[PDB]
Each structure stands twice: as structure tokens, then as C-alpha cells.
Amino acid sequence: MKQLEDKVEELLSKNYHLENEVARLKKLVGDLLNVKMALDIEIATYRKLLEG
Amino acid sequence: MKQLEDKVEELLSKNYHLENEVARLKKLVGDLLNVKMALDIEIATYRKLLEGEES
């Protein structure tokens, strides 16, 4: 029952790559949320200064 | 034998849910990228108006 064996190895590889992609995107989300925090701080500085 | 069938079922199922998660994350990324673009243009404009900074 090989066709089954090839399918399983094919699926284990896809699973490994999907786990990789999930890890990559989580990091990109953390990094972007950190970026948002820093920009929000810069804008707050400007707005506060512009306000008076 | 039937174990192979069970493993095939398990993997197709785990992969389906990982794909769903990948799609969710990519939407969140796209959303954060758009929030960043709006913030960037606001900051770039203040730099220009107040500091004489062009990109």
C-alpha cells in the first residue's frame, strides 16, 4: 500500500512548510505591531507639540 | 494498512487548519501594513511641514 506511503510523505512535507509559514507570519505580525507602537509614539509627539 | 489511512486523514486535517491560520495571519499582516501606510504618510507630512524634510 505504497500510494499511501508516498501520500503520507508528501503530506508531512506540506505540514512542515505550513508550520514554517505560520512561524514566519507570527513574527511578521509581532514586528509590525512593534512598528505600529513606535509610529504611534512619534505621531503623538508631533500632535502634542502641534496642539500647544 | 489502515494506520496509513489514519495518518493521511490526520495530516490532511492538520494541514487544512494550518492553512486557515496562514490565511488569518496574512489578513492581519495586510491590515497592519495598511495601518502603517496611514501612519507613515502623517509622520512624513509633519516632517515636511515642520522640519523642511522631504523623504
Quick one: B22 exposed, middle or buried, by C-beta within 10 A (0-12, 13-18, 19+)?
A: middle
**Are residues A4 and B4 in contact, defined by beta-carbon separation less than 8 angstroms?**
yes
The CA distance from B6 to B41, in Å, is: 53
Partner B, chain A 1-52, Cβ-Cβ below 8 Å: 1, 4-5, 7-8, 11-12, 14-15, 18-19, 21-22, 25-26, 28-29, 32-33, 35-36, 39-40, 42-43, 46, 50
How many independent structural domains does chain B possess?
1
Q: At what angle do helices B3-51 and A2-51 cross, to 10 degrees?
A: 20
Q: What is the CATH number of the domain that holds B11?
A: 1.20.5.170
Q: Which residue carries 515636511 as its cell? A: B48
Cβ neighbours of B11 (radius 10 Å): 19
Cβ neighbours of A43 (radius 10 Å): 15
- State whether residue B2 is helix, strand or coil: coil
The CA distance from B45 to B50, in Å, is: 8
The residues near A21 (Cβ < 8 Å, ≥ 6 apart) are: B18, B22
φ, ψ for residue B52 (rounded to 5)? 75, 15
Q: Which residue carries 515642520 as its cell? A: B50
The CA distance from A26 to A21, in Å, is: 9
A33's grid cell: 505591531
Q: Which residue carries 502623517 as its cell? A: B42
| Domain membership of residue B15 as a residue range | 1-55
